RNA sequence: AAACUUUCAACAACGGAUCUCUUGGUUCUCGCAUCGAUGAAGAACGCAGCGAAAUGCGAUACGUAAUGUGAAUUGCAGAAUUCCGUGAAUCAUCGAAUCUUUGAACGCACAUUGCGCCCCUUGGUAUUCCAGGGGGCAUGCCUGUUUGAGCGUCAUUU
RNA sequence: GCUUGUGACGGCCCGUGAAAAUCCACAGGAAGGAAUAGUUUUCAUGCCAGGUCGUACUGAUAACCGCAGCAGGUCUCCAAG
RNA sequence: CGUGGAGGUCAGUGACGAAGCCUAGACCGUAAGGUCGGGUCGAACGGCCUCUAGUGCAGAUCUUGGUGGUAGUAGCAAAUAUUCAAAUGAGAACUUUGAAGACUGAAGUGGGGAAAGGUUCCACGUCAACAGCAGUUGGACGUGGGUUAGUCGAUCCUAAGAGAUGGGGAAGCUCCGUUUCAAAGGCCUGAUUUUAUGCAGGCCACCAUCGAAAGGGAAUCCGGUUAAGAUUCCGGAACCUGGAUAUGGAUUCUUCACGGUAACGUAACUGAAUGUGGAGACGUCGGCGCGAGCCCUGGGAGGAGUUAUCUUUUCUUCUUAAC
RNA sequence: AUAUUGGCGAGAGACCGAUAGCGAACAAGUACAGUGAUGGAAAGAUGAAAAGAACUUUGAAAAGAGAGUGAAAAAGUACGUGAAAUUGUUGAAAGGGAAGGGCAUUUGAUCAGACA
């Protein structure tokens, strides 16, 4: 007989994710030199809804240590973090909500 | 339709020209055998299929 | 013919391959005439018609029976 | 009438170039005429003459180039022989008749003798 | 309503004209022609379908070039031209 | 007794059997070896004084050059200078050309007559903007040429 | 009043309701620039040019799909008393 | 017994009529069949001995074609509806015009478009077929004519998605990958005053492309005009983009403008790399506010209708585009 | 030396004879159907020669009636022959709810042979 439903899901025809509206992938900073020897400051610029996600995202922007420009990251917001807050990422950083630590 | 590719316009053009009756002087030729135009086409009895 | 008497326009059947620039220059060259603007269109027998407007110095009607048609 | 080919061929580059321009003026006029006249077969022969001139004009420029390439490696692909794609690849007689140095010796020393039976 | 009232909405082309074989067998969304295979470099054809081949082989056309090969072959592929005689 | 029905015949209908035809088909046999990037097979659109097709051909368009023949072509018109002749012809032959838009199809695309780059030239007061003419730019791979890369690696400087 | 357009507001959401071409601005200060005369076309006025293809009509109880001038089907705008 | 074809033969029949077809005319055979006359016809054909097979029909819901009874029969009855006269014409229930009676009732039987058709559009001519009566009429037939753009669309952009490329699979047709384990490419001017463009920097590492005639998007409007085109022609009046450019104004001896406490003003008022910001750019419903067009309405200046009687009345014109 | 339902060029047949033979003897892989892959017909013959019917007449015309051509219009671009089903007309006959059939003879019609 027929191919049952849970076998058709794998080919992802009508079955792929509905993606058009999502903010982007949520990811920590690339574990570069700053973050693994010291820390680096950022600012959450916006905390924002991601379609089809439970929890809001936080756009957090940092300085490029190697070029003159702003590189913006997408975090999943922890409860409490706020627009304007300063976020610290790095080995030698301090232990408050929002920061990112090994 | 009503806003066509040139490809389609072209074909329609060619079509119009093939839509005359047999030029009656062919009838007079030695050994002529063609009586009338046996490939005539009419916009409401046979569709062009582009 | 009417566009020729009333409009100062020469109407030519013209190569499909050729553009508004080419039609203009070729009239200019072949007929000793100055041209204002040139509209074109594809006829339904798939051939191209150029409405050719001459400048106000020229009398296209005069120029019609000099190329020799009437 | 209708221009002759062998009479075109004694004219010069810019005599033929002009004659062409005349038939083209000619032909332009007949076509103006043709649409006032219930038949105009004279046109057939003026538009065959144009062909003729063009043919000759082209003929001459061609055996011009052909000569100034006559006798060299490399010459325009369309003055090369046509033959056939295969024929055109195909070992040349030289690269085909080629025989091993060792074989040549043999061909010389022991070639097929003419002989006869009877006595 | 599966018959004639549903035929009423037949007004979109699945196939248009094929450039290589001009046939209205050019599937728009698939971008290939169901007759001739375009734009596959090769030409669709199949041994189980012989009328189909018969319908399209060499000679069903102008043979603009191939026409003349067998004469050319007879004359040993002559270069140059023919001269003259008399009468 | 008509009318009607039916049966037979003659003349006439309907239909296209039958006989007789056959530039076709089928099958056998003999000789032969030639498609294509030098753009094939195939497609599309065109081309005649008067053609919708079939056949032919490609803007040089039912044809151009050459060669042989030696007076047609023909449905009508026509040329008329072409008939003891470098010469008729919808003739044959074919060695020379022309060969639109395409197609393996090759600058990129193509449900678009859509969109670049390069060289030479011409016009617009222009190396730069616009326009016309001509000539070019796909991919893999081989031999070679030139410019290069790598502390892969040898020598040679002071 | 009616249709439409628009504004500042308000309800809703475990729904919070595209992308890219393209245009401008700003931060920056490389640079280039005057007195015997320089800088300026984001001020005004003035010169030249603008290709290619489509454009007819029907859109339905007869111009489309249903063997057809078929009581079927087939996306939409305008809307008086 | 009969058929198509083959070898032999009758020096067979025949345009002075072969073959075929018709004939309640004749004759031979138990029969398959054979023979003849007459009519029709027009080019070939037959007897005997033998050879040969695609060789004999009433059936197979047999195949193709043709034809009947049914039968002038079922029927041509949905969508309110028609009428008088003239003209035309061989012919008029059906064409044209005038009159009258109605209908659709702006959620249209109105005015336009999208898909799809492709000339049906328009003129002239015109009735053999076709429009299940008709036909002088037609979306039929014959012959012609007609579709005008810098500003409307396409073209550009990107969406779901599609899909080349260094590659990896697969015997292979080809499958996977789309920035992916790739040495992936090009702009600004400088250096030239052998000269046309090599090197000098500095960047920028964005990695094809196709995919919307409803999404995004540079820019045009009114009037007029045709048998048939019009935001496309004519007229007038604008706008955008690219390219060139000079004249004026502005600005500078405090070189790269002043003024305003400020929000900010203005005709201008240099600005490379690099960076950033904004616009493009965005759900839905609800009431409230305002605009436009329409609706209703007073006065006045026209025109039309009704008027036995009544009505300073009924109807209508009085408009203003982009920029 | 072997192969060959393709290609080019040739000679053939106790083959088929227009429903046959290839699907196609013809503007046939056409016209037409299907979104597409694909499916795919019918359709040859006036006569030696168009001599393809001048002219008159009736008709709106198509045509009819005459005339004419021709060996023939009992060949008229419906065209060689022109069967059958099935039809019109004329003539003959029969018929009280089918028709047709067998043996036999009357009556009508028609006919062979034989006499000499
Ligand atoms: Mg299964
Ligand atoms: Mg996905
Ligand atoms: Mg005038
Ligand atoms: Mg245009
Ligand atoms: Mg000649
Ligand atoms: Mg070569
Ligand atoms: Mg269907
Ligand atoms: Mg589809
Ligand atoms: Mg595919
Ligand atoms: Mg391809
Ligand atoms: Mg009585
Ligand atoms: Mg009779
Ligand atoms: Mg027969
Ligand atoms: Mg014969
Ligand atoms: Mg044969
Ligand atoms: Mg033989
Ligand atoms: Mg092929
Ligand atoms: Mg021909
Ligand atoms: Mg001729
Ligand atoms: Mg000669
Ligand atoms: Mg010839
Ligand atoms: Mg050419
Ligand atoms: Mg390509
Ligand atoms: Mg192109
Ligand atoms: Mg070019
Ligand atoms: Mg190499
Ligand atoms: Mg080297
Ligand atoms: Mg609305
Ligand atoms: Mg919101
Ligand atoms: Mg802005
Ligand atoms: Mg510097
Ligand atoms: Mg300016
Ligand atoms: Mg350009
Ligand atoms: Mg329109
Ligand atoms: Mg209609
Ligand atoms: Mg239809
Ligand atoms: Mg159909
Ligand atoms: Mg309907
Ligand atoms: Mg026997
Ligand atoms: Mg026999
Ligand atoms: Mg047989
Ligand atoms: Mg009988
Ligand atoms: Mg007898
Ligand atoms: Mg007889
Ligand atoms: Mg007889
Ligand atoms: Mg005969
Ligand atoms: Mg026997
Ligand atoms: Mg049998
Ligand atoms: Mg039987
Ligand atoms: Mg039978
Ligand atoms: Mg039976
Ligand atoms: Mg039986
Ligand atoms: Mg039967
Ligand atoms: Mg009746
Ligand atoms: Mg009745
Ligand atoms: Mg009924
Ligand atoms: Mg009634
Ligand atoms: Mg009714
Ligand atoms: Mg009526
Ligand atoms: Mg009403
Ligand atoms: Mg209502
Ligand atoms: Mg209606
Ligand atoms: Mg309309
Ligand atoms: Mg249509
Ligand atoms: Mg009309
Ligand atoms: Mg009639
Ligand atoms: Mg009709
Ligand atoms: Mg009728
Ligand atoms: Mg009638
Ligand atoms: Mg017409
Ligand atoms: Mg027409
Ligand atoms: Mg626009
Ligand atoms: Mg463009
Ligand atoms: Mg792929
Ligand atoms: Mg695109
Ligand atoms: Mg668009
Ligand atoms: Mg749009
Ligand atoms: Mg006009
Ligand atoms: Mg209109
Ligand atoms: Mg207007
Ligand atoms: Mg204007
Ligand atoms: Mg103006
Ligand atoms: Mg400008
Ligand atoms: Mg100032
Ligand atoms: Mg930006
Ligand atoms: Mg934004
Ligand atoms: Mg949007
Ligand atoms: Mg505007
Ligand atoms: Mg063979
Ligand atoms: Mg033999
Ligand atoms: Mg057959
Ligand atoms: Mg047989
Ligand atoms: Mg058949
Ligand atoms: Mg034949
Ligand atoms: Mg047919
Ligand atoms: Mg015959
Ligand atoms: Mg016949
Ligand atoms: Mg004949
Ligand atoms: Mg008669
Ligand atoms: Mg005789
Ligand atoms: Mg006879
Ligand atoms: Mg006869
Ligand atoms: Mg006749
Ligand atoms: Mg007959
Ligand atoms: Mg009896
Ligand atoms: Zn194809």
Q: What residues contact residue A74 under an 8 Å CB cut-off, 6+ apart?
A: A23, A24, A25, A26, A27, A57, A58, A59, A60
Q: What residues contact residue A26 under an 8 Å CB cut-off, 6+ apart?
A: A50, A57, A74, A75, A76
Residues 7 to 26 of B: which have CB under 8 A from any C CB? 9-10, 12-14, 16-17
Do the beta carbons of residue C49 and residue C7 sit within 8 Å? no
- Please spell the DSSP secondary structure of C17-65, one letter per residue: T--HHHHHHHHHHHHS--EEEEEEEE-TTS-EEEEEEEPTT--HHHHHH
Q: How far apart are CA E16 and CA E30, in angstroms?
A: 11
Residues less than 5 Å from ion ligand 2, measured at CB: A 16
Q: Is B14 helix (H, G, I), strand (E, B) or coil?
A: helix
Do the beta carbons of residue D46 and residue D30 sit within 8 Å? yes
Which of E12-19's residues contact partners 24+ apart within 8 Å by CB, and which partners? E13/B50, E16/B50, E17/B7, E17/B50
Do the beta carbons of residue C40 and residue C51 sit within 8 Å? yes
Preceding omega of A74 cis (within 30 degrees of 0): no
Continuous segment of H or E residues that includes residue E27 = strand E26-27
Residues of E in contact with B49 (CB under 8 A): 24
- Report CA(D50)–ligand 73 centroid distance (Å): 37
Do the beta carbons of residue E31 and residue E49 sit within 8 Å? no
Closest ligand, as measured to the CA of E33? 106
3-state secondary structure chain D: CCCCHHHHCCCCHHHHHHHHHHHHHHHHHHHHHHCCCCCCCHHHHHHHHHHHHHHHHHHHHHHHHHHCCCCCCCCCCCCCCCCCHHHHHCCCCHHHHCCCHHHHHHHHHCCCCCCCCCC
Measured between CA atoms, how close is E83 to chain D, in angstroms? 14
D60 closest CA partner among D21, D24, D8, D4: D8
Do the beta carbons of residue A71 and residue A64 sit within 8 Å? yes
Other beta carbons less than 10 A from residue C63's beta carbon:
17
Continuous segment of H or E residues that includes residue A97 = none
- Please spell the DSSP secondary structure of B15-49, one letter per residue: HHHT-SPP-GGGGGSTT----S-TT---TTTS---
Task: Inspect the structure and tell me whether chains D and E have 3 or more CB pairs less than 8 Å apart.
Answer: yes
Q: Is E68 helix (H, G, I), strand (E, B) or coil?
A: helix
Nearest CA in chain D to E66: D84
Measured between CA atoms, how close is B14 to chain C, in angstroms? 7
D44 closest CA partner among D35, D58, D34, D57: D34
Token pair 């490809």: residue: B7
Continuous segment of H or E residues that includes residue E5 = helix E4-7
C21 touches strand F (CB under 7 A): yes
**Protein-contacted positions of strand I (CB under 7 Å):** 7-9, 23, 26-27, 29-33, 35-40
C39 closest CA partner among C24, C53, C51: C51
**Protein-contacted positions of strand H (CB under 7 Å):** 113-120, 139-143, 146-150, 153, 159-163, 173-174, 204-205, 213, 232-234, 274-277
D46: left (phi over 0), alpha (psi -120 to 50) or beta: alpha
Q: What letter would DSSP give residue A10?
A: G
Q: Which two tokens stand for residue A70?
A: 């702003």
Contacting partners of chain D (3+ CB pairs under 8 A):
C, E
Q: What residues contact residue D61 under an 8 Å CB cut-off, 6+ apart?
A: none
Resolution (A): 3.0
- Report CA(C56)–ligand 80 centroid distance (Å): 25
D89: left (phi over 0), alpha (psi -120 to 50) or beta: alpha
A58 closest CA partner among A50, A69, A68, A70: A50
Strand-pairing partners, residue A42, are A62, A87
Q: What letter would DSSP give residue A78?
A: P
A82 closest CA partner among A59, A50, A54: A59
């Amino acid at each position: 007989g027929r191919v049952i439903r849970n076998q058709r899901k794998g080919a992802g025809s009508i079955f792929t994710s509905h993606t058009r509206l999502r903010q982007g992938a949520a990811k920590l900073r690339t574990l570069d030199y700053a973050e693994r020897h010291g820390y680096i400051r950022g600012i959450v610029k916006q905390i924002v809804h991601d379609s089809g996600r439970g929890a809001p995202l936080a756009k957090v922007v940092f300085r490029d240590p190697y070029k003159y420009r702003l590189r913006e990251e997408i975090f999943i917001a922890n409860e409490g973090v706020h627009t304007g807050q300063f976020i610290y990422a790095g080995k030698k950083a301090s232990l408050n909500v929002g920061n990112v630590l090994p | 339709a009503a806003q066509k590719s040139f490809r389609i316009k072209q074909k329609m053009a060619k079509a119009k020209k093939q839509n005359r009756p047999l030029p009656q002087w062919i009838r007079l030729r030695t050994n002529n055998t063609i009586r009338y135009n046996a490939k005539r086409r009419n916009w409401r009895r046979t569709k062009m299929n582009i | 013919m009417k566009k020729v008497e009333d409009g100062n326009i020469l109407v030519f059947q013209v190569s499909m391959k050729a553009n508004k620039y080419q039609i203009k220059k070729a009239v200019k060259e072949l007929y000793e005439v100055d041209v204002l603007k040139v509209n074109t269109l594809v006829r339904p027998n798939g051939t191209k018609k150029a409405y050719v407007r001459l400048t106000a110095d020229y009398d296209a009607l005069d120029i019609a029976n000099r190329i020799g048609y009437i | 009438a209708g221009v002759k080919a062998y009479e075109l061929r004694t004219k010069s580059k810019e005599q033929l170039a002009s004659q062409l321009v005349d038939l083209k003026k000619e032909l332009a006029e007949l076509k103006v005429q043709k649409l006032s006249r219930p038949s105009l077969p004279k046109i057939k022969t003026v538009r065959k003459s144009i062909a003729c001139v063009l043919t000759v004009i082209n003929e001459q420029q061609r055996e011009a180039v052909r000569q100034l390439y006559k006798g060299k490696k490399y010459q325009p692909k369309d003055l090369r022989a046509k033959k056939t794609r295969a024929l055109r690849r195909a070992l040349t007689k030289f690269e085909a008749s080629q025989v091993t140095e060792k074989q040549r010796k043999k061909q010389i020393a022991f070639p097929q003798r003419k002989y006869a039976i009877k006595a | 309503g599966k018959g004639t009232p549903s035929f009423g909405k037949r007004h979109n082309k699945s196939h248009t004209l094929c450039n290589r074989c001009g046939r209205r067998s050019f599937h728009v969304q698939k971008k290939t022609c169901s007759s001739c295979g375009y734009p596959a470099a090769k030409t669709r054809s199949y041994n189980w379908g012989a009328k189909a081949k018969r319908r399209h082989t060499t000679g069903t056309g102008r043979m603009r070039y191939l026409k003349h090969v067998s004469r050319r072959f007879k004359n040993g592929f002559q270069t140059g031209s023919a001269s003259k005689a008399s009468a």
